[PDB]
Subunit: 395 residues, 5 copies
């Protein structure tokens, strides 16, 4: 006729059409829907709430048996666009959502002459998947997205795949590499789900496996620790009898304590998780306690409290074994008694000074030996940590 073809085709197709009925001529034949998903970015990964926010492009197609026409008529039209609200649409959802998707509405769909109906839409998904932070900097996380019909059983709707699963898992075409997380793979799988023995449903589960870039957090956590390790080393270099060594040690301990306290609230959030970063912190913690205890012991040994002479049993071997063995390095009577009083006073003063000499020397030797032992221990621990990092990196 003289009417435009795209008008009369739509008039013929949409005439006496019911959108509330499943478009099958036989009710015993299920409606097959084929879907696929392409990842766009990882918006957010919240560990304290275990919430994954992501952006996907999702397209699906199915067959409508009431939307067929002869191509020879209506001016050779193979396909056209039809409003979404005027046709039947399956209710495909995800079981893992926790927030309603704030996605825009697409008001048009393709309709072909064979009954093929296709739908494209973006989806902002806020789902909940379990997150493990046992190795927090180097964690690899899998999350599940389960597409299924919320109401219809497997006797009415199953879900298939638009493309082969081999090429779906290795698309990575439009993913945003810049960010905190890096996508590894998206593995699809089909399953039959049934809580009851009564009804059965068909589900398509996508396992999204992603990895976290550790470049920033590793250095941001390791730099101040080794930095104050060096500061502690120059604190050891100090003399023990100055008296400010204890204040220096407690000031450094306060600084690192407040640093770790205000750091440990940000990254750690999982109740069941226990990262080895805490083990590293506890080891450093203990090394600082040993340092403080050694400093206190040396200060107590060096300090003067009118103490007695060094007891010989240790002394006859201690000074000997730290050189070339381990560390290579009438009026006259009254006048005489009167002057003897001052002589005795100065003699006992000199004896006290000599005792202080010997105790100070012993304390210095012990401080040197303990400093050497601590330095060797720190070097060994640093070597172990760096070789563990290397054996991770080489893989």
């Amino acid at each position: 006729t003289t009417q435009p073809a795209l008008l009369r085709l739509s008039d013929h197709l949409l005439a006496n059409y019911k959108k509330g009925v499943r478009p099958v001529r036989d009710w015993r034949k299920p409606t097959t829907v084929s879907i696929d998903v392409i990842m766009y970015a990882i918006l957010n990964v919240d560990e304290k709430n275990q919430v994954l926010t992501t952006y996907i492009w999702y397209r699906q197609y199915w067959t409508d048996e009431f939307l067929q026409w002869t191509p020879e008529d209506f001016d050779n039209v193979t396909k056209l666009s039809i409003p979404t609200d005027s046709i039947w649409v399956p209710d495909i959802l995800i079981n893992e959502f926790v927030d309603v998707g704030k996605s825009p509405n697409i008001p048009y769909v393709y309709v072909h002459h064979r009954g093929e109906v296709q739908n494209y839409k973006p989806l902002q998904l806020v789902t909940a998947c379990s997150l493990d932070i046992y190795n927090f900097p180097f964690d690899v996380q899998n999350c599940s997205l389960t597409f299924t019909s919320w109401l219809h059983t497997i006797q009415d709707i199953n879900i298939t795949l638009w493309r082969s699963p081999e090429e779906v898992r290795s698309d990575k075409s439009i993913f945003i590499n810049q960010g905190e997380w890096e996508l590894l793979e998206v593995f699809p799988q089909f399953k039959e789900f049934s809580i009851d023995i009564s009804n059965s449903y068909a589900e398509m589960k996508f396992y999204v496996i992603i990895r976290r870039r550790p470049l920033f957090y590793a250095v941001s956590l390791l730099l101040p620790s080794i930095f104050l390790m060096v500061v502690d080393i120059v604190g050891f270099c100090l003399p023990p009898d100055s008296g400010e060594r204890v204040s220096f040690k407690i000031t450094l301990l306060l600084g690192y304590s407040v640093f770790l306290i205000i750091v440990s609230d940000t990254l750690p959030a999982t109740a069941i998780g226990t990262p080895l970063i805490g083990v590293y912190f506890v080891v450093c913690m203990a090394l600082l306690v040993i340092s403080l205890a050694e400093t206190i012991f040396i200060v107590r040994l060096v300090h003067k409290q009118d103490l007695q002479r060094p007891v010989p049993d240790w002394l006859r071997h201690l000074v000997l074994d730290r050189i070339a063995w381990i560390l290579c390095l009438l009026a006259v009577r009254g006048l005489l008694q009167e002057l003897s009083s001052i002589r005795h006073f100065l003699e006992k003063r000199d004896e006290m000074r000599e005792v202080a000499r010997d105790w100070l020397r012993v304390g210095y030797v012990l401080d040197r030996l303990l400093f050497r032992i601590y330095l060797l221990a720190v070097l060994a621990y640093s070597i172990t940590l760096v070789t563990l990092w290397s054996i991770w990196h080489y893989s």
Copy 2:
């Protein structure tokens, strides 16, 4: 006829159908709705606002007397799917909500040939239930969800249970165990509610009882306290006459004060609640005050202010009772007077030195005794705390 069965059945059912009228042939017969709920996860538990955010799967069914047909006709169809907006739907809500549920819309329901109508939907519930944190790490919380019709009375709508209450309370089939909270049970109950003496309503109350995992918070709260207890012990080991003991004690007190101040804002929020964690903090608080007072007293006794000799009454028993009892461990006259001047000066200097000797020894003995007493007290308190934790754990 030649028309498809699923089309003509829907046309016959939805013809001259009013969705604004209760579907009963007799107005004196109430409409019975049977509901059930399955828990999916505990999204959030806010104590400062007393807000519970949870995710449930809720399904209900009822009977429609205007949606019946003969199975022999319309090609043997026992049941079909009908749009939700084209039929009457009861207004079942929860009295405890504080935020509108951001749940998606399910546009289809099942309709059977006997008038059976079923509805499935997910619900994100943000309700308000009282929370008690008297024993915060080991708290067990019950919350109430009251499903009822907001307008219709018991003469029109009651609520029943789809399944037996015995199997409802022990489902736990799809609950997410990973998280902060662990679900214990969901007990259902039916009640008649009436504020006025005028109208009566039927309500279904679900008591959700859940438990909190204490593994993280307990250690995160107990570790720094005992850690600085050890640091305080090495502070006690110090000599009292060094002069830096008071600075060390006040620095440790400042550190633990700022730590507790910046910790006590996060977890404690309830105005009426008073956890025993505060009691533990106050006991440690007092133990630190006793420690500081003992240190100040020892410093005051040890310090030199040109004080007099130790008064004998205490001295004749104090030094004796701390060994093997408790702690086992002319020109000539002018010259003579001139030299006697220096002799007297040095004699009084030696007397001052001896007095300082004796006072220092007394202070050292007292410091040792108080250190022993403090150590025994700390060990006893630690034993009591650990045995209380054990008697909780064994239950």
Copy 3:
């Protein structure tokens, strides 16, 4: 007829019915709406924004002159349920709202045979009312909720009360007592409001008077202050010539300064408000300044700078009035000159030592007197504060 009664009654009532017209046969007769409100909980009280978030159950009724029928017909039906969107509904709002209510939609209302139309709905109200925190822990707050028609004047719609105002103000049936705030009363009042001399409106103002529970904040604010008051007392007990007293005082002052700085941002928010808690803080502030000034003065008096002897005018009464009055407590010539040199040197050394004696004793006496005065002042201030708290509590 054979048609079901609930169907034909609705068909007769809703036939040729216009929902956009006020349902009055005479346009000169205003439509009377009777409303009432029941409080459920106090969700939030924000002082920095002066925002009150609350939850109410609100029900209203009016008369529709186009919804009447004979009870004898339609099978003895006195009342039924009708969709809300198919009938005229007045636009009753609150003038004080600042956020749109996120309340669910109730799609049904009661309709009686006399034209009685009733509506029930919950309302989450986010309004703005002035808050005064002059006595912040013990504040009693009134807020206003003004229900009125936004467009219709008093010639069309007034608002009445469903129940007597005597029983409305003392309902408190479903209020949640657990929380931060406690409800006292809800007083209703009717008023005529008119900005212009042109149009007049009818308004129903509910004054909600509530009270705040002070059990938590009072102790949480008073505990650390008195705690460090005790710590300051043990700091006073210290000797003045030790040299670490000034460091102790400034460390305590820094601790309380940082504590008050990080506390004063949370609770105080009102610009015009000035709580007496700030007055208490300022008084403690000044007492600490007096303490520091006394410590500095005593240290300056005690310290040795090769100063001269104590000037007699004060000394002849100062030491006397602090005991039993207030505080009860040739070769020979060369040799002689040579030895006289040492004699003079030791004599002047002894004179310096005696001067240091006397100045130290004077400083100790002054320190004791000032410590007694400070202790009496603190005890008096504590007595005044506790008796003020008691005279508030007894009321």
Copy 4:
């Protein structure tokens, strides 16, 4: 007729009425809309985002040429209420909005017999206006709200004023005075806006001028500064040779540095703004640096390093000009040589003591002079600041 008048009038008016067409008989005549706005409260002023959140009551009117009727008919009805969605409504918006208004929908409007159509609605406006904080405590801010038609040009719609601009700017009838900001005026203006040379539009710009109450922030910023100024004064009162003066000064500097650091993030947010509060802080900053430098210089001059005698050139005038000028205030030979050894030793010791005497006295005099100079400088600065505050206050 016997039909109710309010029903038949609405039936006659709404019959064959098109709401999608501008209601003019001649297309060349523009439609005039008269609007006005009344301010209710200032909800929020965000400086870091430059966002103004406010609440207004907005009413407008226009003329509809298809809604006229004879008053003599339909029972003397001059005006009625009509649903908003059934009539044409102009699209008047604000160009400055950044967030969609969360305002409720008013479903009724007045219609008069002359075609007068009136509309009332509340509006929660979240707009963006430039904020200047050059004088942050005493800033007066103007913001612009531009009402205009988003699509229609000036050939179709202009905007006029309901009332005279003289009485609009001085309404202030329902404004909430309690809060942070105080409203000064609302000045209206009419303008023609055109980006292109093609189309022209009519706009109504309201300039809202408001003022900020400075009572809280001024005292909250000035109190701790002067407080620690007093504490610094008592620090100056200390002796210079005690050795704890440097620690006191650095502790006070650390306290004020951390205070200013944790304060400067809250109020200052504008990148281009530079308040004079920063100038005050920098001046105090420098005064503290001068204080620390003076303390270090005095400590260096006073300290003992076995230094030599005070060089006479300064000494002969320095001590003189600070009193009453500025500051008013054989065997015998062996024995003789042997004793001469001790005599020389004690003589050189006495010489060192005398040199220390003189250097200590010089340091004390210099410290007193610098303390006087610093006190005079602080008093002058305080006088200047208080007289600047007074000359602002008197205006």
Copy 5:
């Protein structure tokens, strides 16, 4: 006819009009849409989320072949306004959005007699574009906005430009210059996009290039660093044997450490980014470590531990090369032996004092030399930094 023209024109145009069909007489001819965008403000730039929030004014036009009429009829009307929902509207979106735009709805569009249809609307865009902070204060950022049809291919819809691209990039007519960011340019480009080899699409990409104002952050980051550099200088001026130098250095180090820790969380957020501000911080970090090490070494050399005399090999050149070379600056026997005892004691005391003399002088000379070297190094570093800033500024 006597009917109003604007009514009958709309009746003729909207009669039997289908809004669900593409308005083309021939299905082989694509529909061309011409769009343009004008920037209004940069609302937000979030680096941790890489989110750009902006406000644009967007207008588009196309041709409708079913909306044509003869101008001679309907009273000379060239154009009119038509509701948006009654006509076909293309689905043009942006691929980069992450949040649904909260923009208001414009319910009217222009329709001309030639089929020209125009649409104007504001858009609040929340998109995701990569942000690089390698030079954070002086960063220039490009972001992409890709307008395309979400469903229709290039065989149905392409996108053109309303204006020439030369004048689009340099509009900057209504942009808000006040703020954090400054707009540089908006470059448009047309592209054909196709993931598959199957379908092709037309896209219009706008590259928005903007710049950040560095005036605030630069000074706010450089001021405290140089400030405490000056404080460190006055710390160097101190004597080394006082004993409080180490405490001063560690207090300053603690202050700058806590400052940098609480600053480094705000601005730095990108994982892959590494600003040179961190390099500046690390250089200052190292300079402070060198300062502390020098102070510790000088303190260790100066301190007295009853050490021996200065070993001559260094001493014979060290003191010489730092002046005018680099730094210009019977009874008798018993009595004799008795007195010889005191003579020997005082001789050895004098020898110890002389040794302490020499070691103190050597330490003072070394401290002066290291202070000079450190001052020269700091001056050189400051010169390098200021000349780098100058060579950036001149460009």
